[PDB]
Amino acid sequence: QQHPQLRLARQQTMLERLQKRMSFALENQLKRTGQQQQRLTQRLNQQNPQP
């Protein structure tokens, strides 16, 4: 009766919740640099010396 199969499944549930959280944190992290880079680049190409 004292087999551990119940507690093992709960651990699997817990671990998956963790990756969803951290994989989302970095996925939002990269975008914050996506906007800042493309924001300064557009301001740079608006300053052409050719005209």
């Binding site: 087999h3 551990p4 199969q5 671990l15 990756q19 994989s23 944190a25 970095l26 914050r32 640099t33």
Partner: protein, 61 residues
């Protein structure tokens, strides 16, 4: 070897500092890369153990 209990605590804080974001991008790439390796290893141990128990718990030796 790292027990199941501690890995959660290690994983828990790494999620915290990433969620803060104050770390630069280069450190974030390395750190999240190690955090996932903890998850990959921890996940495999449970799967390896459950299939070990089920055979023993069955009528098989």
């Amino acid at each position: 070897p790292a027990s199941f209990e501690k890995a959660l605590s290690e994983l828990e804080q790494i999620v915290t500092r990433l969620e803060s974001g104050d770390l630069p991008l280069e450190e974030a790439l390395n750190e999240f890369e190690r955090g996932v390796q903890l998850a990959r290893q921890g996940q495999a141990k449970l799967q390896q153990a459950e299939q070990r128990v089920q055979i023993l718990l069955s009528d098989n030796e």
